[PDB]
């Protein structure tokens, strides 16, 4: 998907199949304003002579889709099966693409950075309650935090050490085999990333 | 209330007596050893991360006062370690060899800092205030790690050097008859950086 300057959204389609044309596929599109459908439709996967042939590509101009003046506007196109097969239902998706059509963002205006004051800490702020500056509740429920975390439960890949690591060198060197190194998990545990401690330096109104 | 004593890198403060020998003298003396009133706090009062460590209404250093409600406090033998002989009631020993059990960020220590408050009432003979006595000395032969001392509500000083002796001049704080000694002891302090021996903490 692309939006040529002053143009309308343009969909590039390639049939990368070995033999079958795209007559079994329908291209469905929808535009959503902050996730709510604003418009939608269907087009066929057509080439220069009927259904787009195996190995053929085409480009199609979709309807104009002006941005919502507020919030985000997203176009989604999906290739789906027109008809059920023995193994999938009618409308089974094959793959999809999106394009951001949103009007230039209005970033919300954040509060000015403020100088700390002497004296008493607030005990409550909006939905939050604090006990000597420590969060104890949000919106009627007991809550603690926030607490910095650098640890994640190592994935099986995070635990692997067969290929080398890519960090220490140009990854294109050494046939892309990396540089011999311990697993991520090993270095994370050696650095104590799983057992960070929190020390309060200061608290101020 | 100033709790910079906890991270101070100096030798200790207050009414310090010049270092001398441990001697067998016939001077009048008494042992304050015995069962003292004790409580364990999880953090050092008055530090930025300990905003609600103390009971409602208690001031940062209100434990020093002669007017203090310690009725409900447990007792602990002195000398002892609070992490020994108590079936884990006040925590357990921690063994490291080389590694420090806290971040290497001198002179800062963790917020989780077991802090023991000790309160001891004792009697001093009227005769110790007669002109035959020049001064009254309070001696600690070993406290792990840093501690602050109050006598009859008056701050006497702060000690460091866990296996080193420290004497304080309590001539002006003591009285004949009944007296109060209050000692606040922190597990971790700036002194912990100087005390990384291969042994149990
Ligand atoms: Cl922590
Ligand atoms: Na050690």
Q: Can you spell out the DSSP letters for A81-131? A: ESS--SSS-TT-EEEEEEEE-PPPP----PPPP----SSPPPSEETTEEEE
Cα(A140)–Cα(A129) distance, rounded to whole angstroms? 9
Q: Return all residues near B102 (Cβ < 8 A) that are at least 6 apart.
A: A197, B109, B110, B188, B192
Q: What CA–CA distance (Å, rounded) separates A100 from A121? A: 43
Find the closest chain A residue to B113 by CA distance: A199
Experimental method: X-ray
Instruction: Compute the distance between CA of residue B78 and CA of residue B181 in angstroms, rounded to an integer.
Output: 13
Determine contact, residues B190/B13, Cβ cutoff 8 Å: no
Number of CB atoms found within 10 A of residue A130's CB: 16
HSE of B102, CA atoms in CB hemisphere, 13 A:
21
Total CB pairs under 8 A between chain A and B: 29
Whether the Cβ atoms of residue B107 and residue B8 lie closer than 8 Å to each other: yes
Least distant ligand from the CA of B193 = 2
- For residue B139, give how far its alpha carbon lies from the nearest alpha carbon of chain A (Å): 34
Nearest to A130 by CA among A118, A119, A121, A139: A121
Q: What distance in angstroms lies between residue A203's CA and the mean position of ligand 1's atoms?
A: 16
Strand A93-100 vs strand A124-125: parallel, antiparallel, or unpaired? unpaired
Do A197 and B51 count as a contact with CB atoms less than 8 A apart? Answer: no
Question: Cα–Cα distances in Å, from A166 out to A130, A155, A181, A184, A191?
Answer: 45, 17, 9, 11, 19
The three-class DSSP label of residue B192 is helix
B46 in Cβ contact with B61 (< 8 Å): yes
Q: How far is CA B180 from CA B68, B72, B74, B123, in A?
A: 11, 17, 17, 9
For residue A45, count CB atoms less than 10 angstroms from its CB and return exposed for 0-12, middle for 13-18, buried for 19 or more: buried
Question: Beta strands B177-186 and B166-169: pairing type?
Answer: unpaired
B81: three-class secondary structure by DSSP: coil
- To the nearest whole Å, the CA of B113 is away from the closest chain A CA by 11
Q: Is B98 within 8 Å of B198 (Cβ atoms)?
A: yes
Domains, chain B, in order of start with CATH, read 1-201 (2.60.120.260)
B120 forms beta bridges with: B181
Q: How far apart are CA B39 and CA B82, in angstroms?
A: 10
All residues of chain B having their beta carbon less than 8 Å from the beta carbon of residue A134 are 51-52
Rounded Cα distance between A122 and A5, Å, is 52
Chain B residues contacting A via beta carbons under 8 Å: 47-49, 51-52, 102-103, 105, 108, 110-112
Cα dihedral sign for B192, B195, B198, B201? negative
Please give the radius of gyration of chain B, using alpha carbons only, rounded to the nearest integer: 17
Sequential DSSP letters for chain A: -B--TTS--EEEEE---SS--STTEEEEEEEEETTEEEEEEEEE-EETTEEPPTT-EEEEEPPP-PPPSSS-EEEEEEEEESS--SSS-TT-EEEEEEEE-PPPP----PPPP----SSPPPSEETTEEEETTEEEEETTEE-------------TTTT--SS-BSTTS-TTSGGGT-B----HHHHHHHTTGGG----------
Residues 6+ apart with CB under 8 A from B150: B61, B64, B156, B180, B181, B182, B183
Evaluated on CA atoms A160, A166, A169, A172, the torsion sign reads positive
Q: Which of A200, A203, A204, A205 to mutate to test the interface with B (most CBs of B within 10 A)?
A: A200
List residues of A whose CB lies inside 8 A of any B CB: 121, 131-134, 197-203
Ligand 2 mean position to B9 CA, how many Å?
A: 19
Which of B48, B58, B113 should be substituted to probe chain A, the one whose Cβ sees the most A Cβ atoms within 10 Å?
B48
Smallest CA-to-CA distance from A26 within A92, A100, A99, A97 is with: A92
Across the interface, whether the CB atoms of B108 and A203 are under 8 A apart is answered no
Where chain B is discontinuous (C–N > 2.5 Å), the residues before each break are none
Q: Of B142, B154, B106, which is closest to residue B6 (Cα–Cα)?
A: B106
User: Phi-psi region for residue A72, left (φ > 0), alpha (ψ -120 to 50) or beta?
Assistant: beta
Look up residue B19 and give its DSSP letter: P
Reading phi first (left if > 0) and then psi (alpha if -120 to 50, else beta), residue B34 is in left
Q: Name the 3-class secondary structure at B18.
A: coil
Rg, Å, chain A Cα set:
27
What homologous superfamily is domain A1-109 in, according to CATH?
Answer: Immunoglobulins (2.60.40.10)
């Amino acid at each position: 998907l692309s939006l040529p300057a002053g143009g309308k959204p343009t969909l590039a389609v390639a049939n990368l199949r070995h033999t079958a044309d795209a007559s079994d596929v329908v291209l469905r599109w929808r535009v959503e304003h902050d996730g709510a459908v604003a418009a939608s439709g269907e087009v066929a996967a057509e080439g220069s002579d009927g259904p787009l042939r195996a190995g053929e590509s085409a480009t199609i101009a979709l309807p104009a889709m002006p941005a919502a003046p507020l919030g985000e506007t997203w176009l989604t196109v999906e290739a789906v099966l027109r008809d059920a097969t023995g193994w999938a239902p009618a409308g089974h998706p094959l793959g999809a693409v999106q394009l951001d059509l949103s009007a230039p963002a209005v970033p919300t205006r954040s509060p000015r950075p403020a100088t700390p004051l002497d004296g008493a800490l607030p005990v409550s702020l909006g939905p939050a309650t604090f006990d000597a500056g420590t969060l104890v509740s949000l919106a009627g429920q007991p809550v603690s935090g926030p607490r910095l975390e650098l640890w994640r439960a190592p994935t099986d890949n995070d635990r692997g050490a067969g290929f080398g690591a890519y960090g220490p060198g140009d990854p294109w060197l050494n046939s892309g085999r990396g540089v011999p190194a311990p697993s991520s998990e090993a270095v994370w545990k050696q650095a104590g990333l799983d057992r960070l401690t929190r020390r309060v330096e200061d608290v101020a109104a | 209330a100033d709790v910079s004593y906890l991270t101070d890198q100096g030798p200790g403060s207050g009414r310090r007596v010049p270092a001398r020998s441990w001697l067998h003298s016939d001077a009048p003396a008494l042992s304050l050893n015995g069962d003292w009133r004790f409580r364990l706090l999880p953090a050092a009062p008055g530090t930025a991360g300990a905003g609600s460590v103390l009971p409602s209404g208690e001031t940062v250093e209100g434990v020093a006062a002669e007017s203090y409600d310690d009725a409900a406090w447990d007792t602990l033998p002195v000398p002892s370690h609070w992490v020994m002989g108590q079936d884990g009631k006040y925590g357990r020993p921690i063994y490291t060899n080389v590694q420090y059990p806290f971040p290497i960020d001198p002179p800062h220590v963790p917020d989780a800092n077991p802090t023991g408050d000790f309160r001891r009432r004792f009697d001093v003979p009227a005769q110790w205030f007669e002109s035959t006595t020049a001064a009254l000395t309070l001696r600690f032969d070993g406290v792990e790690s840093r501690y602050k001392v109050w006598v009859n509500g008056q701050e006497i000083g702060v000690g460091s050097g866990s296996r080193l002796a420290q004497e304080f001049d309590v001539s002006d704080a003591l009285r004949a008859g009944s007296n109060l000694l209050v000692v606040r002891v922190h597990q971790w302090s700036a002194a912990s950086y100087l005390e990384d021996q291969d042994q149990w903490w």
